[PDB]
Design a protein around this ligand. Structure first.
Ligand code: 37A
Ligand code: CA
Ligand code: CA
Ligand code: CA
Ligand code: ZN
Ligand code: ZN
Length: 158
């Protein structure tokens, strides 16, 4: 499927969840991008205004893309593959309670998965992969991609 055809990729945080400190949202998202730039030639930069490749949005219920959220639980987030417009964008369900830790739903871990989609990855059947469909908390301080995730992303980039 589609991939980004350039190495410098921008993201913009459209709005911030009230669930977390602003700086913690910034850091979680930055770290999640870093997971993927660690294993590809991609470079990610946060921009404050204008058109970014990847728009990060927090929203609940119906939010303008025909892919409505479902309240607390269930769908935690979704993201669109590389392309113009909404392509690349990552949306996080505001009806979740986002955190920096094991409580609620961990933003960093969810963002690693969603950014995988923003870069062109689909779901993996391997329960050890970050691209596995099911959320399960793992210690964020020592988090690592599975071999399957690395094979997947490196088949697309680098
Ligand atoms: O948003 C999701 N998932 C995104 C997601 C997947 C995996 C991780 C993940 C977290 C930690 C480690 C590895 C992967 C994070 C977010 C949800 O998981 C599936 C099934 N599902 C569900 O059963 N919810 O109760 C709805 C939706 O689709
Ligand atoms: Ca939900
Ligand atoms: Ca976009
Ligand atoms: Ca919330
Ligand atoms: Zn959406
Ligand atoms: Zn997914």
């Amino acid at each position: 499927g589609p991939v980004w055809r350039k190495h410098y990729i921008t993201y913009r945080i459209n709005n911030y969840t009230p669930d977390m400190n602003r700086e913690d949202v910034d850091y979680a998202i930055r770290k999640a991008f870093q997971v993927w730039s660690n294993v590809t030639p991609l470079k990610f930069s946060k921009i404050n205004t204008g058109m970014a490749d990847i728009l990060v949005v927090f929203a609940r219920g119906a939010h303008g893309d025909d892919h409505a959220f479902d309240g607390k639980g269930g769908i935690l987030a979704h993201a669109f593959g590389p392309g113009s417009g909404i392509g690349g964008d990552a949306h996080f369900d505001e009806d979740e309670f986002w955190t920096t830790h094991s409580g609620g739903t961990n933003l960093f871990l969810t963002a690693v998965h969603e950014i995988g989609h923003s870069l062109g990855l689909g779901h993996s059947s391997d329960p050890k992969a970050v691209m596995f469909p099911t959320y399960k908390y793992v210690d964020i301080n020592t988090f690592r991609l599975s071999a399957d995730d690395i094979r997947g992303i490196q088949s697309l980039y680098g």
